[PDB]
Design a protein around this ligand. Structure first.
Ligand code: HEM
Ligand code: HEM
Ligand code: HEM
Ligand code: HEM
Lengths: 146, 141, 141, 146
């Protein structure tokens, strides 16, 4: 995906302020709460009975951290997302068989979490830049379906 | 279907929007136009630049429709019947676009109401906007 | 919403299915599993090979549910309430998958009922299956 | 997209029997009837008031013929759909701004039309091969969005 320099600047500047220990878990937790069918893939994580249970679940926070790392990895290779996400694509598509619509959903939940954390700093043009990024990541993760 | 807790959550969150209702609707539209440029083609008679009086005025209309839906949440097909006819028949709005505007409304609420946008309320708001979208796309024929 | 003409069209087309009801349901499932392999993971206790007694038996269940929906087309949320609970709560079926099975049901009907599958009836059947899908995905919580 | 030799055989064999003067128009007409918002892009085509009006419309049949030609073109270049559909992608995405979900919808309508015309010959494995093709075409046509 192609970001303008202005968009790259906006994205990179905000990402440096991201709490990398928490934001991934917040996004994954919210995915599980807002789109409850996604819990089908996480039965080994234990207590997912309530929103509080999900958000406070240590396994959700831990896994969320791994997801955010992958997004961070993608932000460093915007011109080669396919190669960057090749192994993850094989995992999520060939092994897990996650419908790729859910890649889009998690990306949009991440955008909601960024808006929550940054408030007025998450301006409409900053959002538009991040929508390009999460769309790129979703498409790259879905490559094994293509 | 919207649960009792969902209706309570949506009413509470929307209650916090207040006199910013029109403003937030205008911001959601702007977010949609910038993030998803395909949606811009529905508004050729609009100037879609920042600070546009037309987007401001339209945001208030959108907000007022959502407020009507909140106020009549158990009777939404009836409450939104006229608007359903408009969007489906006259305007022929692609159903995908309601998902895009719904997402931008959630982002707008998250950016302005940090205390209200809990995971549970996020879920309720998403269900509510999906319900509104279902009604507004119910009239293609 | 389903129009009077839609209900007439769906009832007429489904009336032609007859004793092949279970058979066509089984064929639609097979089409889905082969075309969209992600859907296979919902059935690990099933042998999904051609001629599988389990897919045959399940096809009849699917068909009987659709027949119930046709017979109670003005009261579908009530008629399908139990099945909605099952698919959303217990099975956690991804909403995308209902679009996939609906498409495969249309393909199955087109392949077997060439005279009935007019453009108008195609449109009515699509709306009907979308309505069924809306009910079956209405219970995520 | 990668088809097996068995799938390639199934696809190519059926396509040779396709009525290239009619099937494209039937698919485009049905798109306009079944998904009426798509009529937004064809106001210059005239009478689209009824299903009979749409299916009998000379402009729908004529345009449908062009679409089918593009699918035929794609079937000849399954290993390079992106290049094959580059100009069409620029048209449908940059100029027309058609949401790419509709590329998927037209592909699935085409599959319905093939089923209608070929009946029991359009077996579940033949369908599965054609679903790979129309997914590939849709993704290639949407490249300018990626
Ligand atoms: C942009 C979207 C996504 C990204 C970037 C992402 C990233 C990751 C990463 C980094 C891992 C860890 C892999 C490893 O340990 O080497 C993982 C594992 C996993 N993902 Fe995701 N993921 C995404 C979407 C999803 C979705 C939507 C689901 C299901 C609804 C899902 C289900 C899983 C599961 C079940 C695992 C554990 C697999 C295992 O440990 O064997 N992923 N993902
Ligand atoms: C939550 C979803 C939505 C709500 C509540 C909503 C509400 C409204 C309202 C209240 C009006 C004005 C009605 C009138 O003045 O008679 C309107 C008009 C309109 N809407 Fe929406 N709408 C929604 C989604 C959409 C989407 C997704 C699109 C396209 C991307 C869209 C395109 C339009 C257009 C083009 C008009 C006409 C504007 C004009 O000609 O001045 N709407 N909508
Ligand atoms: C038109 C849409 C559908 C209809 C009418 C339908 C109908 C049914 C019926 C009647 C049953 C049996 C209920 C019972 O025995 O108590 C069932 C079970 C089931 N359905 Fe569906 N269904 C639909 C869509 C789907 C989809 C899209 C999926 C997944 C891709 C799915 C996955 C399942 C599973 C896994 C079971 C349980 C099978 C078992 O454990 O034996 N269904 N459905
Ligand atoms: C797989 C999907 C599709 C294929 C292969 C396809 C192919 C084509 C082709 C070959 C043309 C003629 C271009 C030329 O004259 O050089 C065309 C034009 C056009 N397409 Fe499609 N199309 C697809 C989907 C769609 C959809 C879903 C829509 C709208 C809902 C659409 C809207 C249009 C319009 C409005 C034109 C006329 C543009 C003009 O003449 O300036 N297309 N398409």
């Amino acid at each position: 995906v192609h970001l303008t320099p202005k968009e790259k600047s906006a994205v990179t500047a905000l990402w440096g302020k991201v709490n990398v220990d928490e934001v991934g878990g917040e996004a994954l937790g919210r995915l599980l709460v807002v789109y409850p069918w996604t819990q089908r893939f996480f039965e080994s994580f234990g207590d997912l009975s309530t929103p509080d249970a999900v958000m406070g679940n240590p396994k959700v926070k831990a896994h969320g951290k791994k997801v955010l790392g992958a997004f961070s990895d993608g932000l460093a290779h915007l011109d080669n997302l396919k190669g960057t996400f090749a192994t993850l694509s094989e995992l999520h598509c060939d092994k897990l068989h996650v419908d790729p619509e859910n890649f889009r959903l998690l990306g949009n939940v991440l955008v909601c979490v960024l808006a929550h954390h940054f408030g007025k700093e998450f301006t409409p043009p900053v959002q538009a830049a991040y929508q390009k990024v999460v769309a790129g990541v979703a498409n790259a993760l879905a490559h094994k379906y293509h | 279907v919207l649960s009792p807790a969902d209706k309570t959550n949506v009413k509470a969150a929307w209650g916090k929007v207040g006199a910013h209702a029109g403003e937030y609707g205008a911001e959601a539209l702007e977010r949609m136009f910038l993030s998803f440029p395909t949606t811009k083609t529905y508004f050729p008679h609009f100037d879609l630049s920042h600070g546009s009086a037309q987007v401001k005025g339209h945001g208030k209309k959108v907000a007022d429709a959502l407020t009507n839906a909140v106020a009549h949440v158990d009777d939404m097909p009836n409450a939104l019947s006229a608007l359903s006819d408009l969007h489906a028949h006259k305007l022929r709005v692609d159903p995908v676009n309601f998902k895009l505007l719904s997402h931008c409304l959630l982002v707008t609420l998250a950016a302005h109401l940090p205390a209200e946008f809990t995971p549970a309320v996020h879920a309720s708001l998403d269900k509510f906007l999906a319900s509104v979208s279902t009604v507004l796309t119910s009239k293609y024929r």
